[PDB]
Every structure is written in structure tokens, then in C-alpha cells.
Design a binder for this molecule. Structure first.
Ligand code: BCL
Ligand code: BCL
Ligand code: BCL
Ligand code: BCL
Ligand code: BCL
Ligand code: BCL
Ligand code: BCL
Ligand code: BCL
Ligand code: BCL
Ligand SMILES: COC(C)(C)C/C=C/C(C)=C/C=C/C(C)=C/C=C/C(C)=C/C=C/C=C(C)/C=C/C=C(C)/C=C/C=C(C)/C=C/CC(C)(C)OC
Ligand SMILES: [Ca+2]
Ligand SMILES: [Ca+2]
Lengths: 53, 42, 53, 53, 40, 52, 40, 53, 40, 53, 43, 53, 40, 40, 53, 40, 52, 40, 52, 53, 38, 41, 53, 52, 40, 52, 53, 42, 40, 42
């Protein structure tokens, strides 16, 4: 719509920004840990070479 | 109003918020394209 | 009904929006976790190829 | 009866609506879990095909 | 509750209409579920 | 003939709320109880087993 | 409770009617259940 | 005695009715459990027929 | 309790009648149970 | 004695009645359980016939 | 005056009704125990 | 002695009566259990006949 | 305790009478128990 | 809530439009998921 | 001595009597238990005759 | 305590007499117990 | 000589209630310590064993 | 303690008397206990 | 010489209630430390064993 | 936009700086610990030479 | 704070952030030159 | 400090010393008897 | 020094005396236990003669 | 050029205390971490072993 | 913080100098450690 | 030359109490530590074992 | 710098001195224990001779 | 003063304290000499 | 802190002198330890 | 001052503190010399 900006007359900008930042950081950490536990792991997969051997 | 903001302040905040959100989404899209080029998952 | 908008004369819009956002985020996380535990898993299914081998 | 609407002069509409929404959501989650745990599971039943094999 | 008679009548009408619509949706979903995976 | 005077002693709101809550809890309890016995209708492989 | 005589009479009438309807629904459901899965 | 009704000038009717209802409901539940735990069980006795076999 | 004599009489009469009805229902249910599944 | 009724000028009738009813109910439940736990059980004694056959 | 606030006549009436009710309850208990002894003797 | 009744000018009659009743009830329960746990048991002794078997 | 002399005398008399009656009942019950199941 | 009639109308219109857009996005995502990994 | 009665100018007679009664009751129970735990038991001694067997 | 001298005298007399009676009962019971089960 | 002045320092009642309570708790200790030894008089089968 | 000189003197006198009596009882009990079951 | 002034610093009553309680707790300890050794006098079967 | 500096009229510079410093320190510690546990460990890998042997 | 204070703070903040990012980039380039992970 | 005059301190010290000496004498007698019965060193 | 007594103008004599007494008693008990736990034990060493044998 | 204005926002005393505490804790942690690896300088028997 | 401009300038100068000295000591220590026990 | 001014900064009584307590605790700790090693002087059978 | 003494117009000398003393004592204890736990121990090294022999 | 004592009181307390401490140390020394005569530990 | 300029200067001088003395003692102790038990 | 002491009191306390500390250190040194004579540890 054209009046969507009026949402800022209902929601406080500061709280919205703080919540967005915190949620994005926590989500990034969570997704990185979740992908680390699958077979898509990029650290402990001995590519290009294994450095402990 | 509830937040104490006038109409002009709301319009300006909405414009800048949309710009920043679009930039963030563009960065995310670029990163995901790079990841798909490296390690396809589907 | 024609007079459905009067639902906003009983329920506070800010609380409704906050509840909707929180519930939708929690539901999305829950459904993704539920689908990950079944045989519909897309990360750890060695498709297209297995990267740890 | 014809005067059933008078039940709204006894019970508060807002609390009734909130209770209805919460109860319906919790009941939906509970019934979905219950049907998931039985023989009527639709996710982990290898239909149409098994994607992990 | 602080409601007048007319407000109670209007709320009852809208409540009944919405409840009937919700029940219709539930009935349609259960018909589809029975068509797919009968349980009885 | 004067049974209606029971509403001059008991508050209608509390009666209605208690009735609704008790009926819901009783329904859940009885459904569980019948579900744990030999009368189970979900895990009985009727009309046909779907996991096999 | 603060209710007068007429309010008590009206509430009793509507309560009786609603409870009878609920009992009728319960009886119909139990008849269907007995037709499907007898237990005694 | 003929004056037994004066028992209502000592005990509060509302509390008596509430206590009676609660006690009767709890006693009904308890007795149904107790009869269920013996060999008088009517649910899990395979009469008239066993439905899980 | 704050009750007068007439209120006590009326409450006692209605209480006795309701209690007798409840006892009659209980007796009928126990007769049916004995006819189905004797225990003694 | 002849003046035994004077016991009601020192003891409160309502508390006495409530204590009596509560004690009698608890005693009845306890004695029924004790009789059940002994050889005099009437539910789990297969008389007249055993129904879990 | 009195600790419980009752008068002499009130105490007499309460004592009479209490005794009557207690005797009725004891009679019911005795009948039940006679039936139980007739069914399942324990001594 | 002839002046023993003066013991009621020192001890409160109501507390004495309540204590006596409670102590007698508790003592009765305790002694019944104590005799019930010995070989003087009258319930679980198969006299005059065993009813379970 | 707030009791007078006459009140104490009356309470003592009734207390003694009731205690003697209770002891008599106890003695009768113990005689019956000894007749049934001696323990010494 | 303190809202007037016009504010309620405007909020309802914008809420309905946004909800429809969200439902459309959800439908598109579920169609894409069905094209890849059918579950029924 | 001849002035022993003045002991009642320190100790409250009510407290002394209550303490004496409570101590005597507790001591009686404890001594009965202690004699029961030894080989002086009179309940589990099969005298005059064993009743369970 | 707040007791006068005469009240102390009377209480002492009655207390002593009651204690002697209690000790006499104890002695009789212990003679019976020694007659039944000697322990030393 | 002047030992009676010890009661102008120490409170009688707290002392008469302290002598009694100590001598009853010492009575129960010195009796349970001579029952856990070879001097027990109850479980010693003298004069005769009554449960045999 | 609030005691005068005479009260303290009489206290000490009867305190000593009763303590000596208790010592006599204890000594007699220990003498007979030694006569029965010597421990040293 | 002037040691009696130690009572213008310390409180007689607290000193007298502290000597009594310490010497009763010391007495009970030194009697249980000599009962756990080869000096026990109760379970030493001297003068004769009584449970045998 | 060109008015991005106006964000400082919404947020508080001191809290932002403190949060940034704390988050950066914690993130650095966490990432170093995570990399230490993988195959990319640089301390305990016997390169260029093992010093305990 | 006023508008000019916000402008000055934004300028200095952006400059410092760019310097920090440059340092991070240099460190990651050195790490890649030493121990490649991809 | 403790509210005692000089004379009260003198008297308390005298009786305290006398009682302590008597207690130590009783202890010494008991220990001599114990040594006579059951020597430990 | 010749002015050591001034230590009593900064340190309270009563607290010093109480602390000294308590510390000396506790130290005496501790040292006696420590010497008891070694082979310097004088009670349980069968000297001059064993009394339990 | 105007970096010193950072001291018109942050309190110098708190900054100094935080810096000192953080540096001390970091030093302890890094010394432990290097001790737990094979870069240990205490239990490496260099130059010689003193317990043998 | 209650600091004037000149105080801020002086504190910044001294803080920078001390930080540079600390970093110099740190790099000297790390050079010695690399000379003794190389880790990369 | 002006070290005594430290007493215009620190409270003498607290310093003295802390010194005494720390010295006592350190003495106990060091004695226990030396006891736990092979420098033990009590349980080392020198000059002669007394339990044998 | 030449004005380094101004550090005492910011930090309280008493707290600084107390913190220094406490930290140095704790560090000394910690380092002594750490050296004791390694093979640099000077107590349990049987040098010059072993005294428990 | 902190403790509320004058100079003379401090002097008297110090004298008596030192005398008592010396007596206690003498008793300790005698006891340790007896213990060494009985059970040498070094 | 309430200190003036002169007090700060004097405290700094004495603090520096004491710190240097402590560091010298530590250095001497470490030299002795290295002479006895080298660790590197 | 922060402790309520004058300059002369500070001088006197410092002198007595130094003397007592030196005496304590001398006693410790003598004890350690005796211990080294009995049981050398290095
Ligand atoms: C196979 C998996 C790939 C990988 C696939 C992806 C994909 C796909 C994505 C990332 C994204 C990220 N990855 Mg990665 N990533 C990998 C492994 C790593 C490793 C590592 C040590 O292994 C690290 C440290 C990172 C770190 C990062 C972050 C830079 C970023 C997380 C966004 C966030 O949480 O900010 C959220 C914080 C806020 C929103 C706060 C608001 C903004 C603040 C003030 C500034 C944020 C800085 C911003 C994240 C930097 C963007 C520049 C990028 C370098 C392009 N990745 C491997 C190699 N990674 C995401 C991303 O690029 O976001 C742009 C992303 O979509
Ligand atoms: C064999 C089992 C079938 C299945 C059989 C059924 C049956 C039978 C029913 C559902 C119903 C539902 N199912 Mg289903 N369902 C299956 C698998 C799923 C999966 C999954 C990941 O596998 C999910 C996420 C869902 C989710 C859903 C929800 C959309 C819905 C419950 C809503 C609710 O609780 O309202 C509570 C919330 C409120 C009351 C709030 C008020 C309404 C708000 C404003 C909007 C709610 C969304 C509404 C449901 C929209 C309906 C439109 C479409 C018909 C979906 N089902 C499988 C395929 N499902 C129920 C339903 O359709 O209700 C209409 C229903 O009767
Ligand atoms: C072998 C066992 C049978 C079975 C035998 C029975 C029997 C017998 C009965 C039910 C009843 C019910 N069953 Mg069933 N039921 C079965 C399996 C199910 C399953 C399932 C996933 O398997 C579900 C979700 C249900 C759910 C239900 C509810 C609709 C209802 C519970 C009443 C209640 O608690 O309201 C209590 C709530 C209140 C009193 C609040 C006041 C009223 C509110 C505002 C409205 C309530 C809606 C009402 C329940 C709908 C009635 C229409 C019915 C569909 C007939 N049944 C199987 C197939 N079921 C009962 C019933 O039909 O009641 C009419 C009943 O007697
Ligand atoms: C081998 C053992 C015998 C046996 C030997 C004895 C002996 C011996 C005695 C009892 C006594 C009692 N026994 Mg029996 N008893 C047996 C088994 C039972 C069983 C059972 C289920 O097996 C029950 C329920 C009882 C119950 C009783 C009570 C009636 C009574 C406990 C007194 C009390 O506590 O009130 C104390 C409460 C108060 C003092 C409160 C004040 C008064 C209140 C208001 C009214 C009290 C009612 C009074 C108990 C009525 C008793 C009169 C009749 C003689 C029954 N017995 C078996 C058969 N029993 C005692 C008794 O009869 O007392 C008279 C007693 O001496
Ligand atoms: C081998 C062991 C003997 C035995 C040896 C003894 C000996 C020896 C004694 C008792 C005594 C008692 N025994 Mg017996 N006793 C035996 C078995 C029992 C059994 C049982 C079920 O087996 C019971 C219930 C009892 C119970 C009793 C009590 C009557 C009495 C406890 C005194 C008390 O505590 O009051 C203390 C309460 C108070 C002081 C409160 C003040 C007084 C109150 C108001 C009234 C008290 C009632 C009084 C006890 C009545 C006693 C009169 C008759 C002698 C019974 N004995 C067996 C057979 N028993 C004691 C006794 O007889 O005392 C007179 C006693 O010396
Ligand atoms: C092998 C060990 C010997 C033995 C060797 C010793 C030696 C050695 C001593 C005792 C002492 C005591 N022994 Mg012994 N004792 C043995 C066995 C016992 C047994 C037992 C059941 O076996 C008991 C009950 C006792 C009892 C006692 C106490 C009377 C006394 C503890 C004093 C105390 O703590 O007061 C603490 C209370 C106070 C300090 C209060 C302050 C002063 C008050 C006014 C006086 C208290 C009363 C006084 C102790 C009574 C003395 C009379 C005695 C019977 C001589 N002994 C065995 C046989 N016993 C000690 C003693 O005799 O003290 C006099 C003592 O030195
Ligand atoms: C194989 C892995 C490599 C390695 C790969 C990397 C990579 C890649 C990076 C680091 C980075 C860092 N590494 Mg490294 N690092 C290794 C092993 C180590 C070891 C060790 C004992 O083994 C240590 C102590 C470190 C320590 C460090 C820090 C200096 C730095 C993270 C700082 C921080 O969290 O800023 C958070 C603190 C703030 C934001 C506060 C604000 C700034 C304050 C005022 C000053 C901070 C000091 C600053 C970091 C100095 C850096 C300049 C030089 C490049 C050192 N690394 C090994 C050799 N390391 C990161 C870095 O260099 O950042 C510049 C980085 O990108
Ligand atoms: C293989 C490992 C090497 C080793 C490699 C390193 C490396 C690399 C470094 C150290 C550093 C340090 N090492 Mg080293 N170190 C080793 C073994 C030890 C042992 C030991 C018992 O074995 C000890 C006690 C130490 C202790 C020390 C500290 C002197 C210092 C820690 C700095 C700090 O935390 O201050 C932080 C406190 C503050 C910032 C507070 C502010 C200033 C305060 C008031 C004064 C600080 C005094 C300062 C540390 C003295 C520095 C002088 C140096 C001796 C040259 N190392 C072994 C031999 N060590 C670091 C260092 O030298 O820093 C200069 C460092 O970079
Ligand atoms: C192989 C080990 C040696 C041994 C080696 C050493 C060495 C080395 C030292 C001690 C010291 C001490 N040893 Mg040693 N010690 C041994 C075994 C013992 C045994 C025992 C039961 O075996 C005991 C009880 C002691 C006890 C003592 C203390 C007297 C003293 C520590 C006091 C203190 O902490 O002051 C802390 C208290 C304060 C600071 C309070 C202020 C002073 C107060 C007012 C008075 C304190 C009394 C003072 C210590 C008297 C010392 C004079 C004589 C030298 C005894 N040692 C064995 C034989 N011991 C230390 C010492 O002699 O200190 C002088 C010391 O350096
Ligand atoms: C003020 O009044 C005005 C003037 C306004 C007039 C209006 C008056 C009105 C409207 C009055 C209405 C009154 C009503 C409706 C009264 C209803 C009364 C009822 C229904 C009473 C029912 C009573 C039932 C009782 C008391 C049953 C008791 C049974 C007991 C205690 C059984 C116990 C059994 C036990 C303990 C068994 C235990 C053994 C086992 C093994 C089962 O334990 C588990
Ligand atoms: Ca015996
Ligand atoms: Ca012996």
C-alpha cells in the first residue's frame, strides 16, 4: 500500500532496530552451527589437504 | 501518536529503512550465489 | 462480514502484530526442525554428492 | 433461545477471543503430534519414494 | 462487561458468522484428509 | 419449582467457566484413556496399514 | 450474586435449553460410537 | 428431628454445595480408576471381540 | 449464615428433593451394573 | 451427667461438625483400602466368576 | 457471656438434634456391619 | 485431694479436651497398626477360611 | 482460665464421670479381646 | 483500544492486503517445495 | 528442707505440668519401643500359641 | 509466677500427693511385670 | 563463706531449667552407650530366653 | 538477677541440701549396680 | 599483684557460662577418644564377659 | 540514503560502542576456539617440529 | 545530541570502521596465504 | 567497662581462684586413680 | 622499642584476649589430632601392655 | 584528527580499569592454552629431566 | 564525562604514547619467543 | 626518605590485623605442604619407630 | 610522558595499592603451585637424598 | 585514642600482658622438654 | 581523588622508586633460580 | 589525612613497625638456618 509508513506510528523504531540486530546475529550463529554438523562441513573435511597428517 | 513521531518523520524513516533492507538482501543474495557456486546442496 | 473491521476496537493492534511476528518465527523454526528429523532431510542426504568422501 | 446474545452481557468478548485463539493453536499442535506418533504418519513413511536411499 | 444490548447483538451475529466459516473450513479439510488417508 | 433460585447463590460466570474447563479436561482425559486400551482406533491397522 | 428474580428465571431457562441440546449431541455421538465399535 | 432445617443457620449453603460437587467428582474419578485396576475391567477385556487382532 | 427461618425451610426442602433424585439415579445405575457384571 | 449439653457452651458447633465429617470420610477411605490390601478383598477374588478370561 | 456465644436453650436444642443424628448414623453403621458379617465373616 | 478441681483454674478446658481427643485418636491408630504388624493379625490369617483361594 | 469456683467444680464432676465411662468401655473391649485372642 | 472508526477501517484494509501478500509468498514457496521433494 | 514449696515462685505451674505430661508420654512410647526391639517382646513370642500358623 | 505464698503451699501439697500416687501405680505395674517376665 | 553470691550473677530459672534438661539428655546417652556394649541387660538371655 | 542477700543465702542453703540428696541417690544406685554387674 | 583487674575488662557471667559449656564438651570428647582405643573399659571383657 | 547519520539521533553512541567492543571480543574468542578444534589447528599439529619428542 | 554532532560522529565512525575492516582483510589474506581452508 | 568496682573485682578473683584450685585438685585425684588402674604411658 | 605499650592504644585489649584464647584452644586441639594421626600415637600403640588382648 | 573527542563520551577511569582486567585475564588464559599444547616449556624435559 | 577539550587532548596523547610502548614490549617478547620456539 | 607517609594513606589497625591473619594462614599452609612431601618429619620412623 | 603523574588525579591510591598487594600474593601462590605440579618440583625430587628411606 | 585508654592504663596492661605471656611460654617449654624426654621425634 | 598536583608528584616519585626496588629483587631471585634449576 | 594521623604519629609508627619487622625477619632467618642444618632440601 501507500500508507505502509504509518506502521512507524505504531511500532517504536529503536526497539525494532535492536530486535532486528539481535535476531539476525542469533540466527546467523544458529544456521552456521547447523550447517557445521551436516556433511556440508567445510572446516573438518580434509579439503584441499589434511594438515594434521 | 503512540510513538510520538509525526508524518514526515515516519515517511523519512520508512524510506531509509527500505533502502537499508534492500541493500542487506542484495548482500545476502550475492553470498548465497557464491555459496551455491562453491558447494551446491540441492 | 461488512463490519469486521470493528475487531480493531477490541484488540490492540500493537500486541496483535508482535504476537503474530513472534508466533510465526517460532512456528517456522519448529517446522524446519521437524522436517529435518524425517527422511525429507535435504542437508544430510548425500545429494547431489557427498562432500566428506 | 432467542436471547442467546445476552451471553455477551456476562462474558468479556476480548478474553473469550484470546482464549479461543490460544486453545485452538495448542489443540492443533497436540493433534498433529498425536497423529504423527501413530501408524498414520505421513512424513516418515517412504511414500511416494524414500529420499535418503 | 459494560456492553449495551445492540453491541451484544452485533457481536453475536459476527461471532456466529465467523464460527460457521471456520467450521466449514475444518469440514473441507477433514473431507480431503479422509479422501487421502482413511483412518476408520 | 423454585430451582432457578440456585442462581441467587452461585455466580453464573464462575459456573460457566468451571463447566467449560472441566468438560474440556474430561474430554481430553477420556480420549487418552480409551486411546491406551484395546479400543484404540489409530494404531489398529484398519482399514489398512500405511507404514507397510 | 446481585441477580433479581426475573434475571434468574431467564438464565435458568436458557441454561436448561443449552444443557439439553449438549446432552442430545453427546447421546448422538455415543450412538454412532456404539454402532461402530461396541465395547460392552 | 423436625427442626433439622436449622442446620442451614450454621453452615453456609454456597460452601456446602461447592464442597459436595467437588467431592462427588473426585470420588467418581477415584472409584472408576479403582474398578479399572481390578479384574472387573470392561475396556481391556476383549469382550465382545478384540479389535487389535 | 445470615439466613432467616423461611429461607432455611425452603433451602432444606429443595436440598432434600434434589438429594433424593440423585440417590435414585445412583440406585438405577447400580442396578444396571449388577445386571451386567455382578461382583459379589 | 444431666448438664452434658453445656459442652456446647465451650466447643464451637460448626468446627465440630466440619471436623466430624472430614474425619469420617478419611477414616472410611482408609479402612476400605486396608480391607482391600488383605485377604478379605472382594474385587480381585474371582467370585462369582473371573471376567478377564 | 459464653465462649461460643450460645445460650442455654440453643445448647439444649443442638444437643438433642446432635444425639438423634448420631444414633441414626450408628444404627446405619450397625446394619451395614451385620450385612458384612453375614456375607464375609472375618473372625 | 478435696481441692483437685482447682486444676481447671490453671489449665484451659477447651485445649485439654481437643488435645485429649486428638491424642486418643492417634494412639488408637498407632496401636491398631502395631498389633496388625505382629502375628496377632486378625485380617490376613486365613481364619475362619481363606477367601482369595 | 477465667473460670470461677462453681464452674470448676461442675466441670470436674462431669469430666470425672465421662472419663470413668470411657475407661469402662475400654475395659469391656479388652475383656472381649482377651476372651477371643489371648496374648500373654 | 482508543481507535476511531476511520482508523479501524484503514488498519483493516492494510492488514488484509499485507496478509494476502504473505499468503501468496507462502503458496509460491510451497509450490516450489512440491516440485522438488513431493511428500504425499 | 521445710521451704521447698517456694519452688512455685519461679516455675509457672502450667508450663511445668505441660512439660511433665509431654515428657512422660514420649518416654513411655520410647521405652515400649525399646523393650519391643529386644528379646523381651510379648507380641512376637508365639506365647501362648502361634495364631498365624 | 505471680503466686502468693499460700497458693504455693497448696499447689505443693497437691503436687506432692499426686506424684506419690503416680509412683505407687508405677511400682505396682513394675511388680506385675517382674512377676510375668523377669529381666535381670 | 561467700559462695551464695553466685546467685547475684547467675539467673536461677535459666539454671534450674538447664540442670534438668542436661541430666535427662545425659541419662539417655549413658544408657544407650551401655546397651551397645557387653553389659546390655535386655538382650543377654539372662535370666532365660523368652523368644526360644 | 534482682535477688537480695537473704534470698541468695536461702537459695544456696537449700540448693546444697537437695544436691546432696541427689548425690546420695546416685551413689546408692551405683553401689547396687556394681553389686550386680561389675565393669572394672 | 594486680591481676584481679582482669574482671574490669571481661564479664564474669559470660566467662562462667563459657567455662561450664567448654568443659562439658571437652569431657564428652576425651571420653569417646579413649573408648575408640585399646583402653576401652566397657567392651574389654574384664572382669568377665556377660553376653557369653 | 544521504541522511544515514540521523541514526545517531535514534541510538545512543556510548551503548553502541560498548556493545560493539564486547561483541567483537567474544566473537574473536569463539572463532579462535572453534578453529582450534578442527583439522586447521596450528598449535598441536607438530609443525614445524614436535618439541615434546 | 544535535545534528552537527551526529554528522561528526557518523564521519568518524565510518572512518574507524573502514580501517578495522581493512585490517581484518589483511589478516585474512595472510591466513589464506599460510593455511588455505577452501 | 563491666560495671565492677575494685572491691568486687578483688572478691570475685579470690573466690574464682579458690574454686579453680579445688577443681584442679579433684582432677588430679581422678587422674592419679586412673593411672593406678590403667596406665597408658 | 621503648614505646611498644602504645600498641594498646590502637588495639582493643578485650578482643585481643578473646582471640588469643580461642586461637590457642583450636590450635591445641588441631596439633593433638595431627600427632595422633602419625606413628607418634601414645594411646593406640600397645604400650606398656595391650589391654584388649 | 578529532579522535580525542572519544574521551568526551567514554569515562577514562572505567576504560583503564577494564583494559587492565581484560589484559590480565587474557594473559592468564593464553598462558594456560599454550601450556596445554605440545609447546609446553615446563614438562618437556629440556634441558634435562630433574625428577630422574 | 565532564572533561574539557584540553583535558581530552592531553589524555589522548598520553594514552597513545603508553599504548605504543606496551605494543613495543609485546612485539619484542614475541620476537624472542619466535627465536626460541617457532610455532608456525 | 618520606616512606612514613604511607601511614597517612593506610589504616594501621587494618594493616596489623591483615598481617597477623595472613601470616598465621601462610604458616599453617606451608607446614601442611611440607608434611605432604617426602620431607615429613613425623611419620618417617626417625629416630625409631614407636608403633613397632 | 612528562605528565604521567597525573594518573594519580584519576585513580585512587588506596585501592590501587590494595589491589596490587592482593594480586601479587595470589599470583605468587598460583605460580608456586604451577611449578610444583610440573617436573621442576624441588620437594619431591629426592635431592640431595631421600629422607623417607 | 581509638581504644579509649590513657597512657598509664596502657603501660599497666602491657606489663601484666608480658608477664603472663612469659609464664605461659615457660609452661610450654617445660611440657615440650618432658615430651622430648619421653618420646623424641627428631 | 582529591589529590593536588604536588601530592600526585610525590606519590608518583615514591611509587616509581618502590616499584624499581621490587623489580630488582625479583630479577635477583630469578637469576638465582636460573643458576640452580635452568628451565629453558 | 585519610586516616586521621598527624606527621609525628606517622614517624613513630613507621619506626616501631620497621623495628618489629626486622626482629621478625631475624627470627625467621634463624629458624630457616636451623632447618637447613637439620634437613637440607636443595
Ligand atoms: C559453506 C558455508 C560458507 C559460508 C556461507 C555463508 C552464506 C550463504 C552466508 C554467510 C553469511 C556470513 N558468514 Mg559465512 N560461510 C562460511 C563460513 C564462515 C566463517 C568461518 C570461520 O568459517 C565465518 C566467520 C563466516 C561469517 C559470515 C558472516 C560475515 C555472515 C553472517 C551474517 C551475520 O550473521 O550478520 C548479521 C548481522 C546483522 C544483520 C547486523 C546488522 C549489520 C551489521 C552492523 C554489519 C554486519 C556485517 C555483515 C555481516 C558483513 C557482510 C559482508 C560479507 C563479508 C559479504 N562464514 C562458509 C565458507 N555465509 C551471510 C551473509 O553473507 O550476510 C551478508 C550469508 O548469507
Ligand atoms: C494426514 C494429516 C494431514 C493434515 C490433516 C489436517 C486436518 C484434518 C486438519 C489440518 C489442519 C491444519 N493443518 Mg494439517 N495436515 C497435514 C500436515 C500439516 C503440516 C505438515 C508440515 O506436514 C502442517 C504445518 C499442517 C498445518 C495445518 C494448519 C494449516 C491447520 C491447523 C491450523 C490451526 O491449528 O488453526 C488454529 C488457529 C486459529 C483458530 C487462529 C484463527 C485462524 C487464523 C487467523 C488463520 C489460521 C490458518 C487457517 C488454518 C487457514 C486455513 C486455510 C487452508 C485450509 C490451510 N498440516 C497432513 C497432510 N490438517 C486443520 C485445518 O485445516 O483447519 C482449517 C484441520 O482440520
Ligand atoms: C472410538 C472413539 C471415537 C470417538 C468417540 C467419541 C464419543 C463417544 C464422543 C466423542 C466426542 C468428541 N470427539 Mg471423538 N472420537 C474419536 C476420535 C476423535 C479425534 C481423533 C483425532 O481421533 C478427535 C480430535 C475427537 C474429538 C472429539 C470432539 C469433537 C468431541 C470432544 C468433546 C469435547 O471435549 O468438548 C467439550 C467442550 C465443551 C463442553 C465446551 C462447550 C462447547 C464448545 C463451545 C463447542 C464444542 C464443540 C463440540 C465438541 C462439537 C460437537 C460436534 C461433534 C463433532 C459431534 N474425537 C473416535 C473416532 N468422541 C464427544 C462429543 O461428541 O461431544 C458432543 C463424545 O461424546
Ligand atoms: C484383635 C484386635 C481386635 C480389636 C481390639 C480392640 C481393643 C482391645 C480395643 C479396640 C478399640 C477400638 N477398635 Mg478395635 N479391634 C479389632 C479391630 C478393629 C477394626 C477392624 C477394621 O479390624 C476397627 C475399625 C476397629 C476399631 C476400634 C474402635 C471402635 C476402637 C478404637 C478407639 C478409638 O480410637 O477412639 C478414641 C477416640 C476418642 C477417645 C474420641 C472421644 C470419643 C469419640 C467422640 C467417640 C469414640 C467412639 C468410640 C470408639 C466408640 C466405641 C464403643 C464401642 C465399644 C465400639 N477395631 C480387632 C477385632 N479394639 C478400643 C475401644 O473399644 O475403645 C472403647 C479398645 O480398647
Ligand atoms: C512386658 C511389657 C508389658 C508392659 C509393661 C509395663 C510397665 C512396667 C509399665 C507399663 C506402663 C504402661 N503400659 Mg504397658 N506393658 C505391656 C504392654 C502394653 C501395651 C500393648 C498394646 O502391648 C500398651 C498399649 C501398654 C500401655 C501402657 C500404659 C497404660 C502405661 C504407659 C504409661 C504412660 O505412658 O502414661 C504416662 C502419661 C502420663 C503421666 C500423663 C498423666 C496421667 C494421665 C492423665 C493418665 C495416664 C493413664 C495411666 C497410664 C493409667 C495407668 C493405669 C493402669 C495401670 C493401666 N502396655 C506389656 C504387657 N507397661 C506403665 C504404667 O503402668 O504406668 C502407671 C509402666 O510402668
Ligand atoms: C579409663 C577412663 C575411666 C575414667 C577416667 C577419668 C579421668 C581421668 C577423669 C574422669 C572424669 C570424669 N569422669 Mg570418668 N572415667 C571413666 C568412666 C566414666 C564413665 C563411664 C560410664 O564409663 C562416666 C559416666 C564417667 C564420668 C566422669 C565425670 C564425673 C568426669 C567428667 C567431668 C566433666 O566432664 O565435667 C564437666 C563439668 C564442669 C567442668 C562443670 C564445672 C564444675 C562442676 C561444678 C563440677 C562437675 C561435677 C564433677 C565432675 C563431679 C565430680 C565427682 C566425680 C564422680 C569424682 N567416667 C573410666 C572408668 N574420668 C574427670 C573428672 O573426674 O573431673 C572431676 C577426669 O579428670
Ligand atoms: C590459523 C589461524 C591463525 C590466526 C588467524 C587469524 C585471522 C584470519 C584473524 C585473526 C585475528 C586475531 N588474532 Mg589470530 N590467528 C592465529 C592465532 C592467534 C593467537 C595464538 C595464541 O595462536 C592469538 C593470541 C591470536 C590473536 C588474534 C587477535 C590479535 C585478532 C583477534 C582480535 C579481536 O578479537 O578483536 C576484537 C577487538 C576489538 C574490535 C576491539 C577494538 C580494537 C582494539 C582497540 C584493539 C584490538 C587489537 C587489534 C586486534 C590489533 C590487530 C593488529 C594486528 C593485525 C595484530 N591469533 C593463527 C596463527 N587471526 C583477526 C584480526 O587480525 O583482526 C584485526 C583476524 O581477522
Ligand atoms: C613459550 C612461552 C614463553 C612465554 C612467552 C610469552 C610471550 C610471547 C609473551 C609473554 C608475556 C608475559 N609472560 Mg611469558 N612466557 C613464558 C613463560 C612465563 C612464565 C612462567 C612461570 O613460565 C610467567 C610467569 C610468564 C609471564 C609473563 C608476563 C611477564 C607477561 C604477561 C603479560 C601480562 O599478562 O600483563 C598484562 C598486564 C597489563 C597490561 C597491566 C598493565 C601494565 C602493568 C601495570 C604492568 C605489567 C608488567 C609487564 C607484564 C612487564 C613486562 C616486562 C617483560 C618481562 C619484558 N611467562 C615462556 C618462557 N610470554 C607477554 C609480554 O611480554 O607482555 C609484555 C607476551 O607477549
Ligand atoms: C622440617 C620442618 C621443621 C619446622 C621448620 C620451620 C621453619 C623453617 C620455620 C618454622 C616456623 C614455625 N614453626 Mg616449625 N617446623 C617443624 C615443625 C613444627 C611443629 C610440629 C608439631 O611439628 C609446630 C607446632 C611448628 C611450629 C612453628 C611455629 C612456632 C612457627 C610458625 C609460626 C607462625 O606461623 O607465626 C605467624 C604468627 C605471627 C606472625 C603473629 C605475630 C607473632 C606472634 C605474636 C608470636 C608468634 C610466635 C613466634 C612464631 C615464636 C617463634 C619463636 C621460636 C623460633 C619458636 N613447627 C619441623 C621440625 N618451622 C617459622 C618460624 O620459626 O617463625 C619465627 C619458620 O620460619
Ligand atoms: C437461600 O435459598 C433460597 C431462599 C434462595 C431458595 C433456593 C434454594 C435452592 C435453589 C436450593 C438448591 C439445592 C440443591 C440443588 C441441592 C442439591 C443437593 C445435592 C445434589 C446433594 C447431594 C449429596 C450427596 C452426598 C452427601 C453423598 C455422600 C456420600 C458419601 C460421603 C460417600 C462416601 C463413600 C466412601 C468414602 C467410600 C469409600 C470407599 C472407596 C473404596 C470407594 O474409596 C475409594
Ligand atoms: Ca538380662
Ligand atoms: Ca571392663
Amino acid at each position: 500500500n501507500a500508507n505502509l509508513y504509518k506502521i512507524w506510528l505504531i511500532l517504536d523504531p529503536r526497539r525494532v532496530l535492536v530486535s532486528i540486530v539481535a535476531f539476525q546475529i542469533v540466527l546467523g550463529l544458529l544456521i552456521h552451527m547447523i550447517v557445521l554438523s551436516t556433511d556440508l562441513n567445510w572446516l573438518d573435511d580434509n579439503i584441499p589437504v589434511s594438515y594434521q597428517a | 501518536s503512540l510513538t510520538g513521531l509525526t508524518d514526515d518523520e515516519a515517511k523519512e524513516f520508512h524510506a531509509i529503512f527500505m533502502q537499508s533492507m534492500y541493500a542487506w538482501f542484495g548482500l545476502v543474495v550475492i553470498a548465497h550465489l557464491l555459496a551455491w557456486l562453491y558447494r551446491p546442496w540441492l
